[PDB]
């Protein structure tokens, strides 16, 4: 009887992803249905990081204020293409949002992120589930940001504007919603020096985070060689050539078994002068030999098969 | 004009096409590789092949016409209603972008490359080959005969096209096959124009993300094809009779033949401004609209719409698309010789101008009217926008004032003095000024007509400044008298403002004229 009394104290008579799905549901920032099937598909990937990405905007945008700014921008006295000078029509924008930080808060960026425009890898800010937060159209946000260019100003303001632009373009939601023609993005890139832009981008993101490098190359392919000159600089590479640095990085990723980063690195490197397409190149042959060595086709990561296919396709390209 | 329409050095004209370009060994290998990858349904590798060498090298990778059609079909497979199918096709989304989005981005970038021929950036042979591929795709995208509501030809014998054995990409029929139907192309245009301003999330997603960009690309490609047809397909010197027949066979003529209806003017005016703020006149019959690809009006449970667009942004995009359609129609109309009219399309420039003017004058919301009459580039839309503005102003004066003053401002754009004298004559008649006949009860409607009339005058003044510049604003007494007459009109409006019928100040164009060419309200605020 006494043993049973202690046994009664003990509880009598799946949860594979219940905790993760529940935590995603609690922090959803969305007023809507949020069907359970979406949570199930998002929390049960187990293969790819499609749903985990850098999000510069983590809060719902101030719709009314942004609509008011758009109404003021659409119709004004000049009604002409905005010049880099004359204050960028400051008569209303200064009254609505005196500082760029206020505009970023209107976009939905939190004040803490605005204070430090950097990606915190320790806090896993680069890999986060989508916050499902409503955002303004990318073109209007880019025009509002361009209204705060202020070329005739100190270096700190220009650097802050460039870092804010780089963080905004790298955002998963902005990248998904970005228009096919990056006219405003190209204009902003042309405003700053290419080397300065690359230096600021490398300051914001990690050098080994090739996923963001591939995303930036998708946004701006012409910067690829320049980006490599920042990643595998001959002066910073000692006597070793850029190709030798690329081989060493490939070897270290191969040894570390960072297959996702290796795949993104391979995607980023190909198409440049250092690693051009072609069947006769020795580097692609070495890469294919290594991939064939690791590949077993019985219990292997999908990244190995994807790398094999991509390397074969690039080798076939003349 | 540009090198795009006047580059025929590497072309090999054929019976099917005059722009045909032969393939080199490297281009043939690229075409074969793309077709082989498309056959295995490996679209992700096709997009990677196109993106990896884009902008990173002097040479250009030419997309084959069949691959262009495949990309057009992929653009229709939006994530919001096809998320499970896309996820099944590409379980590992290495690009982290929808296949539809990547295909649309590639199509837009290649269209931008085609629009300006950079001989220094890219070799002429590659640019001509890309132009040939796009023109072949447009020829395959020819609309069928309009319905109120031959399978595949490969010019290149070097390789076997992927589209020969398949008619669907991922459960969706090819765009060329779908549009080559009696009631689909006009239906698609009506669907996108209706859903452009729709508040409903599925309808708004269907057009904004898919149909609006594809329609813009098609309009640009048809304009380029029309330019090529006028430049080369015509016989140069003509008796003015064969030229009309050739224009009836022009790509724009076939494009607008699918929208001929019974009366082109009224039906076209209703179609372009479908689901707009204007009140529908004469109880016109409703136009049936249905989704083109299965459930375009449905959103899959997996997709979550996290994007909100302001009504102004949607209106601006919709009015820009409408302006592009009207510009294409006017570009086709301007080529018609005077006196003669096209045989296959029953289109008259005067009828279209009158219909557009009637639709614009019927607008009850000033924001849409301003969006239609405000353009980033005046030179691009200089051929039809002044005519529409003059027609709208004439109709507004006709309804507001019993006396209709004939307006010759479009021909007066050449001479600023004549334009200013005509403006002085119009303001002296009080047609431009607020009408005393209008009752206090209908004051808001009179203000709505007056502001639209002011917008039309501002558009005409902007075109006059584009044509003559600022050289004799004060040097010529006529322009100074015109500014004084504008001040007198402002005083007439201020008389009703002092009447205190409504708190809102009546719209005054004096500040806008002062900003544009009024030299700071003349001497009023020069100090």
């Amino acid at each position: 009887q006494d043993l049973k009394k202690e046994i009664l104290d003990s509880p009598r008579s799946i949860t594979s992803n219940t905790v993760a799905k529940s935590e995603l549901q609690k922090s959803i920032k969305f007023s809507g249905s949020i069907p359970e099937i979406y949570l199930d598909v998002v929390t049960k990937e187990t293969i790819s990081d499609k749903y985990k990405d850098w999000h510069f905007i983590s809060k719902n945008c101030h719709y009314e204020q942004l609509m008011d700014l758009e109404m003021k921008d659409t119709a004004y006295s000049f009604l002409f293409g905005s010049s880099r000078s004359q204050g960028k029509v400051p008569e209303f924008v200064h009254l609505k949002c005196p500082s760029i930080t206020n505009l970023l808060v209107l976009f939905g960026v939190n004040q803490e992120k605005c204070n430090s425009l950097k990606i915190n890898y320790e806090k896993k800010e680069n890999s986060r589930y989508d916050n499902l937060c409503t955002i303004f159209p990318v073109n209007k946000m880019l025009k509002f940001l361009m209204y705060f260019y202020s070329d005739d100003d100190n270096d700190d303001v220009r650097e802050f504007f460039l870092k804010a632009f780089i963080c905004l373009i790298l955002d998963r939601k902005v990248f998904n919603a970005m228009e096919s023609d990056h006219r405003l993005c190209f204009k902003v890139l042309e405003l700053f020096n290419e080397a300065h832009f690359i230096n600021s981008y490398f300051e914001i993101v990690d050098k080994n985070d090739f996923f963001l490098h591939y995303r930036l190359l998708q946004i701006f392919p012409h910067l690829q060689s320049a980006l490599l000159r920042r990643r595998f600089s001959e002066k910073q590479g000692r006597t070793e050539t850029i190709q030798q640095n690329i081989i060493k990085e490939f070897n270290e990723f191969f040894d570390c078994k960072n297959y996702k980063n290796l795949l993104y690195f391979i995607l980023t490197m190909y198409g440049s002068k250092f690693i051009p397409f072609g069947p006769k190149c020795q580097v692609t042959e070495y890469f294919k030999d290594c991939i064939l060595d690791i590949s077993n086709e019985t219990t292997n990561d999908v990244e190995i098969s994807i790398l094999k296919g991509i390397l074969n396709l690039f080798s076939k390209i003349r | 004009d540009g090198a795009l329409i006047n580059s025929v050095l590497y072309v090999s004209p054929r019976n099917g096409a005059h722009y045909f370009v032969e393939l080199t060994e490297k281009h043939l290998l690229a075409f074969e590789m793309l077709n082989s990858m498309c056959l295995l349904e490996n679209y992700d590798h096709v997009l990677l092949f196109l993106e990896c060498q884009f902008g990173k090298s002097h040479n250009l990778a030419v997309i084959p016409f069949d691959i262009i059609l495949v990309l057009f079909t992929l653009s229709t497979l939006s994530e919001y209603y096809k998320e499970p199918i896309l996820r099944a096709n590409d379980p590992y989304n290495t690009s982290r972008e929808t296949l539809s989005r990547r295909a649309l981005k590639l199509l837009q970038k290649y269209l931008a490359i085609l629009k300006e021929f950079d001989s220094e950036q890219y070799n002429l042979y590659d640019l001509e080959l890309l132009r040939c591929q796009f023109f072949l795709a447009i020829d395959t995208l020819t609309p069928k005969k309009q319905k109120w509501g031959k399978t595949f030809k490969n010019p290149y014998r070097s390789y076997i096209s992927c589209l020969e054995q398949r008619n669907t990409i991922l459960g969706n029929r090819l765009l060329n096959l779908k549009l080559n139907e009696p009631g689909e192309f006009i239906n698609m245009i009506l669907w996108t124009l209706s859903n452009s301003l729709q508040e409903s999330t599925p309808l708004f997603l269907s057009s904004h993300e898919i149909w609006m960009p594809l329609l813009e690309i098609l309009i640009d490609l048809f304009s380029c094809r029309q330019d090529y047809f006028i430049q080369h397909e015509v016989a140069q010197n003509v008796s003015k009779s064969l030229f009309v027949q050739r224009l009836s066979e022009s790509p724009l003529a076939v494009f607008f033949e699918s929208l001929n209806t019974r009366n082109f003017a009224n039906r076209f005016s209703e179609y372009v401004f479908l689901n707009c703020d204007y009140k529908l006149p004469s109880d016109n019959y409703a136009t049936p609209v249905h989704p083109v690809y299965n459930g375009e009006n449905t959103i899959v449970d997996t997709y979550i719409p996290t994007i909100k667009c302001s009504p102004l942004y949607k209106s601006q995009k919709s009015l820009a698309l409408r302006r592009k359609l009207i510009g294409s129609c006017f570009k086709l109309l301007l080529r018609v010789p005077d006196g003669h009219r096209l045989i296959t399309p029953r289109i008259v420039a005067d009828d279209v101008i009158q219909g557009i003017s009637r639709t614009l004058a019927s607008f009850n919301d000033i924001l849409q009217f301003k969006k239609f009459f405000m353009t980033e580039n005046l030179s691009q839309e200089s051929y039809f926008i002044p005519l529409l503005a003059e027609g709208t102003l004439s109709e507004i004066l006709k309804d507001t004032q019993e006396c209709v003053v004939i307006l010759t401002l479009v021909e007066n754009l050449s001479d600023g003095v004549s334009f200013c004298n005509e403006v002085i004559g119009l303001v002296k008649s009080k047609c431009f000024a607020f009408t005393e006949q209008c009752s206090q009860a209908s004051y808001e409607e009179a203000v709505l007509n007056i502001e639209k009339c002011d917008v039309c005058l501002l558009v005409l003044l902007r075109y006059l400044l584009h044509l003559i510049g600022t050289e004799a604003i004060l040097d010529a007494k006529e322009q100074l008298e015109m500014l004084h007459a504008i001040e007198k009109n402002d005083s007439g409006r201020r008389q009703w403002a002092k009447a205190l019928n409504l708190g809102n100040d009546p719209p005054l164009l004096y500040p806008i004229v002062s900003q544009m060419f009024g030299v700071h309200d003349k001497s009023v605020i020069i100090e």
Binding site: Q1, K4, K5, I7, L8, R12, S13, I14, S16, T46, I47, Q244, I247, N251, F254, D255, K280, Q282, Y286, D289, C290, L292, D293, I294, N296, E297, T298, T299, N300, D301, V302, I304, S305, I306, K308, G309, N312, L313, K316 | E32, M33, N35, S36, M37, L39, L40, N42, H45, P91, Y92, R157, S158, Y159, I160, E164, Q165
Partner: protein, 451 residues
Amino acid sequence: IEQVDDELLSLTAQQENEEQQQQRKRRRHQFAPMTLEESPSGYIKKVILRNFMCHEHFELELGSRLNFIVGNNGSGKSAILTAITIGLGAKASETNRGSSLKDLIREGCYSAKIILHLDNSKYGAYQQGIFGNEIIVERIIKRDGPASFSLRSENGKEISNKKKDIQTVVDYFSVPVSNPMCFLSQDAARSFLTASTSQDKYSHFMKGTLLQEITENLLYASAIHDSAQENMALHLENLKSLKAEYEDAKKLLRELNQTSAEKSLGLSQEEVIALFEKCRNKYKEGQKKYMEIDEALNRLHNSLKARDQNYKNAEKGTCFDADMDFRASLKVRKFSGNLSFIKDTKSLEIYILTTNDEKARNVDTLSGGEKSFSQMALLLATWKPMRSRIIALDEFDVFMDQVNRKIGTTLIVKKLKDIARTQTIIITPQDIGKIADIDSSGVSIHRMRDP
């Protein structure tokens, strides 16, 4: 059914063993920069067969890239291929040459020796410092006693006598000895070249590219997963019924607490408390079994998804390589062709357009010579995706007649002389010297003086 759970646990253990084996493997290439045109190392420079089958000790120096043995049929024509397969290491049943290894030995002699000289002087060598410029593989087959092996070097120092070292060297050199298609016998070549049905072509292509075994393993794992999911649903229903019975037992235990009456309860309190204790033990063991089955099912589902993605990527890559090789091969005859693989019909369809027709007709709607050329191009396009250091083929003169045979030989020479990564040994009775296409470099003809 507990047998389904046992099969699921065994499959999970096998997957864990396979992933541990995958983790154990390391890269074996050091990427020496060096300088393409030069062939890689590992090709067979020379073969000597002493007292092997019919002929006595014979020396044959094979070429670096392409070989044409002109030994006549009935004079130990297939002896060279059989000796190479035995020396490199292959199953006796796979070779299908001879009733037994004892019969391979020459009659009247107790022992037979097979010696192969793999080249290590060039790049890509395996332990060139230890083995030197050449690796000598010697196999001794005796009627009495097990077969002996020696991995001796040039000086004759026997590095090893085990079978694992030979397999490791062959794997490093990438010679698919286990794959029967890389070394085609007369029967295998006849079966592959004479295939007419699209399903037969698809089956041969899948078997040759080693994709059929992956599909069979994936299908078996999928069937085991479906059976395990059905058994898991049955176990969940049984666990819920047991949980309801244990909840009733807990209510009886609460009644036991209230009593702690017998005629109202019916069963003795000691029996009921013992039943509750055993029911609690069964509940705990059932919960542990359910958790183990759920974890195994989830791991199997994730492994199946990964395997499906990997198999799809590998199949797409192999099909793309085969299609590109086939398109390149068909350019020789001024034809435009393509391959289509259909899972719904499980068939491979070849579409070829010639100079006369403007539409790509089915390969079946062609002449015998065109079909034979298409079959030869398919054989080359199937050999291409699997990178093989050494490929051996027997005679093909009986499958093509007159002009088409010459065209097929020309296609083989053109497609195989250019590649330096693969060394090809072709054994045909027809005199290659008669063919005008012998001037091309990289082709080695070894004609046996004795008929």
